[PDB]
Design a binder for this molecule. Sequence first.
Ligand SMILES: [Ca+2]
Ligand SMILES: [Ca+2]
Ligand SMILES: [Ca+2]
Length: 128
Amino acid sequence: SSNLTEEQIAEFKEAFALFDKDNNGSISSSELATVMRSLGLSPSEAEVNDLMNEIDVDGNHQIEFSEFLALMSRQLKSNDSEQELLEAFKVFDKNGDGLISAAELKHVLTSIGEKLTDAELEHHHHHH
Ligand SMILES: [Ca+2]
Ligand SMILES: [Ca+2]
Ligand SMILES: [Ca+2]
């Protein structure tokens, strides 16, 4: 399947929980950051909002169950949406597929480890 189905969503409902503390469905740079700080790095709130800005379609400072998954839908034949964002979330795609799924976002949640970088595909390091 090359599209998100009730299955994938049903699978994402989990991967999300991992990032969802109150399990409300909406994640805030605060909570999201709380996940990173646990990973290894410690992104600043203002530094997170930067990442939450992209995921944010309106800038409410919240990631909807649709948006979050959108980060994976971003991919598409024609480039009618920021695809450079998929480069940052590529860390999850160690198989270098260019696309990440729920089982991948949930598998990464654990697969995480110091041995991780955003230079996976990103030709040039955003932060030279
Ligand atoms: Ca949450
Ligand atoms: Ca939003
Ligand atoms: Ca993949």
